[PDB]
């Protein structure tokens with residue numbers, strides 16, 4: 079197909095060439111006549127391994143060209159890939175300036191041409207951008223309507239600089255955000271030949287996706303730095319430490335621990351986090367990320383409390399009490415924290431937990447349950463249907479498989495608050511998730 | 515093997531059972547008489563899938579028993595595993611009360627004992643605990659010297675409650691902290707049949723290994739929760755978002771981005787960290803972790819500074835300028851920032867980077883290099899030898915392989931400051947690493 083590409087920076091030029099070398103008619107579009115002159119000369123504006131070669135191949139076959147003429151580029155192509163920059167404003171919000179101009183330029187170019195055009199955003203933008211800005215802009219400028227007259231979708235890239243090409247060739251995944259089915263299919267052909275999954279989501283979800291990947295990346299670099307700093311301070315090598323950790327593909331580098339949900343608890347995570355940062359503090363090793371964990375963890379408890387507590391009623395049924403399903407361990411259980419908050423603030427609380435139950439007559443914790451936390455434990459009710467019937471707000475606190483059935487057999491008159499993720503879908507006025 | 519286990523809690527009881535199911539002789543020991551008794555009836559003190567059944571089998575083959583007679587346990591076994599809990603003190607630090615107690619008794623036991631007894635610590639303890647607490651208390655109480663007379667070693671655990679047994683039978687890996695080969699071999703013979711890599715390291719490293727793993731899990735949950743919160747405030751399901759993130763094993767769930775070293779930079783990571791948090795703020799969504807990345811990131815740059823400016827010499831050579839090797843992209847390069855700080859402090863700064871040097875000749879970002887950051891670029895030097903020779907302190911800022919030679923065979927009279935990880939080993943008087 080014939081592709082126009084708006085913005086010829088690191089991702090735009092890489093695109094220009096990668097597509098042009100696969101059999102596409104590619105028109106590189108940029109505001110600066112230096113980048114374009116370089117392109118027509120078949121030369122790379124950047125130092126990127128193997129880019130020049132690709133670009134020179136684009137001119138030799140006549141499959142690639144550049145022009146500063148936006149309108150033409152549109153009228154001469156069937157698909158436009160938006161790759162212009164979105165730099166930071168002085169307050170952190172991203173500057174949409176460039177994106178807007180391109181959008182206008184495109185809309186104006188469509189007002190003319192009668193055939194359908196396809197506008198795919200690749201530039202990283204906050205969620206809601208395509209819907210609240212690029213669409214209405216194009217529309218208001220083309221006098222047309224997104225979806226019906228012209229296609230719109232988003233297409234995040236994950237190219238790294240200095241390996242943009244190989245990243246292009248072998249991506250982790252290909253993700254597509256679609257308004258119209260038609261625009262989605264076009265992208266599907268485009269990456270059809272790539273040995274990686276294709277993931278079709280709504281425009282917004284896609285926008286969130288690319289942002290999360292990037293912040294996760296900084297999160298990782300940050301972790302390794304803070305850990306390495308503590309390492310040096312205590313005499314060992316961070317590199318050696320992080321290597322071993324990167325060996326674990328069951329916990330450290332899997333999807334485990336990555337489900338958005340409730341605070342973490344137990345008799346290990348919170349103490350070790352406290353134990354290592356205290357030590358870091360003794361060695362004069364600052365550590366803002368490591369040192370914000372607990373703070374965040376508590377926020378999450380508070381959050382559940384604010385959700386549960388917002389329905390004009392004291393009647394709460396708390397399903398799950400141990401720090402996690404399948405164990406009776408109550409040590410630093412966020413659910414007890416939660417329970418204790420509700421009690422301290424006067425709520426009519428009723429609790430269900432068959433494991434904590436079994437333990438009240440079958441363990442080495444009897445003492446603790448009847449003398450250490452009687453104000454919590456005496457609120458335990460073993461009849462699950464009783465807890466549901468006499469509560470107004472039902473709170474799914476842990477992964478007990480028994481709570482699924484509950485999630486699909488919920489009676490009228492009850493609010494659900496989901497903290498682990500049993501809900502098949504997103505919040506409604508009757509059922510709310512802490513992160514959905 | 516005859517194995518004694520001190521601390522019949524969640525970790526110790528599981529160990530007792532699994533070990534004994536594997537044909538060893540196990541003496542469970544704990545301070546609580548009520549614990550020992552449930553163990554002698556083959557009953558489980560805790561609610562943990564399949565533990566009871568293991569404990570009864572342990573009894574029924576006479577391969578597993580229990581007592582409070584510490585001395586007897588050490589006297590009738592060749593190796594002990596220390597599994598006593600380590601609780602938090604009001605200040606976050608670790609309470610070695612229980613560990614110490616169990617160390618004293620053992621020492622007293624191995625004294626009266628002629629043959630080599632082997633001590634393994636499974637309890638999670640800070641780096642250096644074993645060298646400065648366990649060994650000394652046992653040496654003292656036993657009159658014997660750690661290493662030659664009795665074996666010592668560290669051996670963390672990654673079992674997760676509720677899947678403890680599965681986790682024991684199928685671990686991510688086995689980590690051995692060894693002092694004397696003898697104990698290291700002993701542990702390996704035990705875990706030989708486990709389908710996982712065995713990792714042998716110095717005590718201090720394994721101690722730091724286990725900790726890093728726990729705080730890393732706590733960070734994953736933390737990242738995931740804070741992302742889901744923002745996800746939900748922006749209208750989408752944080753779960754749909756986190757599933758996709760977890761579908762990427764090249765960048766997201768891989769070892770990339772996990773090398774301790776220098777702050778991140780470039781025109782994407784920092785810009786995106788700032789944008790998301792900015793949005794997060796607009797929406798009243800607290801995010802202590804996400805929101806601390808930049809301070810921490812910026813605290814790494816300053817860290818590199820302090821390293822460099824501590825050598826009583828104004829002559830500094832910065833090898834690498836662009837945000838990474840393989841590109842000339844200068845946007846928000848931490849190396850540039852480093853340079854500007856060094857400049858503002860009046861250092862004789864010389865800079866090598868073959869990519870930018872090339873870029874300021876071919877490419878499109880020459881204006882920036884020439885007219886926007888002249889005060890950095892005129893400190894450029896084309897010849898790497900010229901920079902190395904005329905500087906007293908060399909900085910390895912990015913991973914350009916050209917710098918490998920400099921570190922393998924370094925001209926005397928130079929101080930090395932390794933920001934990326936070229937050094938084969940730890941810090942010395944001539945070559946200092948940022949996280950090693």
Ligand SMILES: Nc1nc2c(ncn2[C@@H]2O[C@H](COP(=O)(O)OP(=O)(O)O[C@H]3O[C@H](C(=O)O)[C@@H](O)[C@H](O)[C@@H]3O)[C@@H](O)[C@H]2O)c(=O)[nH]1
Nearest residue numbers: 335336337338339340342343344346671672673674675735
């Ligand atoms: N929000 C959220 N929370 C999670 C997720 N996965 C687990 N959690 C929670 O994180 C906390 C820790 O649970 P987990 O690590 O499964 O169990 P446990 O704490 O018993 O085991 C951990 O400590 C052991 C230990 O140090 O003794 C470790 O060995 C072990 O590997 C774990 O790190 C729990 O409160 C969990 O609910 C998730 O995807 N999302």
Ligand SMILES: Nc1nc2c(ncn2[C@@H]2O[C@H](COP(=O)(O)OP(=O)(O)O[C@H]3O[C@H](C(=O)O)[C@@H](O)[C@H](O)[C@@H]3O)[C@@H](O)[C@H]2O)c(=O)[nH]1
Nearest residue numbers: 235236237238239299771772773774775776778779780782
């Ligand atoms: N300390 C440390 N720093 C690292 C490591 N790995 C990478 N870095 C740094 O993290 C920063 C980003 O590098 P990288 O992600 O490899 O390059 P780039 O930032 O150009 O690509 C990223 O931005 C693209 C984008 O959003 O446009 C993404 O698409 C892409 O996937 C990356 O996130 C750099 O400053 C790196 O130095 C590490 O293990 N340790």
